Design a protein around this ligand. Structure first.
Ligand SMILES: [K+]
Ligand SMILES: [K+]
Ligand SMILES: [Zn+2]
Length: 354
């Protein structure tokens, strides 16, 4: 009954060499790690080693062009790093970025392998840079390679090709790259909750709306839960899990759960504007633990208030370790009722549980 934990200080080497205060900070991961130490969660976990992803593994989801361009940045002079970063939507690059992206993905592969070999029941991955905005062919939104999507394909590569992987993306932003990578796929169920604001919120695409349900054999296996016009928090997220996430997930019957666990919907985040609490994140984690015989891998995505992400992800690890769910302190914001009902209208044709 072991919980794994992967953390490697070398992932702090990725940095913004022009803006030391850019919110995707190296100390995001060291702060989360430190809070696990203070709460004495670290010694209750088995340490899973980091490793570099291989180029062959990156090619599970990304084009060889994209791999080669990010790879080339390791030897790039500052002016060229600045210019290359500016060719993407919201990317900064340093000479260490490629290696850190490789480390984040490989750390998650090792964690998924530890779960799927029965060496640990579940695991938490304290990694950066994040992944869920990265597309097959391009970097986006602080993300170079799509760690969670690659981990889903990696898991299938060591088990069977059609292994049912659920990805729950509770980062406040839509994971455009994860949706696109699996949009035609019925073996990977993508469920995202995100601030949407009728397409005005990053990443600024109507691809994130509730009516994008998947394509081809993937029709029904893409679930977007978009928030509009309100400061959403625990009641809205609990209601979305109750009416949507958990009924769909149970019907899908995943063999592995990956959480694209951004903590930028947390109270205090400078970018998300929401107010999910650490206790809320613990309850979402505990609900997901009922799936896939407990095989849950929690993967850090966004989240930019250092205190908020440290308390929030530590509470998630406490849940993985088997601790009792904390006590939770309200009627939904009206637009959140509308959002949930819109998703129910979009997906009840595909899911008998709805
Ligand atoms: K999301
Ligand atoms: K899908
Ligand atoms: Zn985010």
């Amino acid at each position: 009954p072991i919980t794994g934990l992967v953390y490697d200080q070398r992932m702090m080497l990725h940095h913004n060499m022009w803006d030391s205060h850019h919110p995707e900070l190296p100390q995001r991961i060291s702060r989360i790690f430190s809070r696990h130490e203070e709460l004495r969660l670290l010694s209750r976990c088995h340490r899973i080693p980091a490793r570099l992803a291989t180029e062959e593994e990156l090619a599970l989801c990304h084009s060889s062009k994209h791999i080669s361009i990010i790879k080339s940045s390791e030897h790039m002079k500052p002016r060229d790093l600045n210019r290359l970063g500016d060719e993407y939507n919201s990317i900064f690059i340093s000479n260490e970025s490629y290696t850190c992206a490789l480390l984040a993905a490989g750390s998650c592969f090792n964690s998924a392998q530890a779960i799927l070999t029965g060496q640990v029941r579940n695991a938490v991955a304290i990694v950066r840079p994040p992944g869920h905005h990265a597309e097959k062919d391009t970097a986006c939104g602080f993300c170079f390679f799509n760690t969670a999507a690659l981990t889903a394909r990696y898991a299938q590569s060591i088990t069977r090709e059609s292994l049912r992987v659920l990805i729950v993306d509770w980062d406040v932003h839509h994971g455009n790259g994860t949706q696109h990578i699996f949009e035609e796929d019925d073996s990977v169920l993508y469920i995202s909750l995100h601030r949407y604001e009728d397409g005005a919120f990053f990443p600024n695409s109507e691809d994130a709306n509730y009516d994008k349900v998947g394509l081809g054999k993937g029709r029904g296996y893409n679930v977007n839960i978009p928030w509009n016009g309100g400061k959403m928090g625990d009641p809205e997220y609990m209601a979305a899990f109750h009416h949507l996430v958990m009924p769909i997930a149970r019907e899908f019957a995943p063999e592995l759960v990956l959480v694209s666990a951004g903590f930028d919907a947390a109270r205090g985040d400078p970018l998300g504007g929401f107010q999910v609490t650490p206790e809320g994140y613990a309850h979402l984690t505990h609900q997901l633990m009922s799936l896939a015989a407990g095989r849950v891998l929690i993967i850090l995505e966004g989240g930019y208030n250092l205190t908020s992400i440290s308390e929030s992800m530590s509470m998630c690890t406490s849940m993985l370790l088997g601790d009792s769910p904390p006590s939770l302190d309200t009627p939904l914001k009206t637009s959140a009722t509308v959002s949930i009902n819109n998703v129910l209208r979009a997906h009840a044709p595909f899911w008998s549980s709805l």
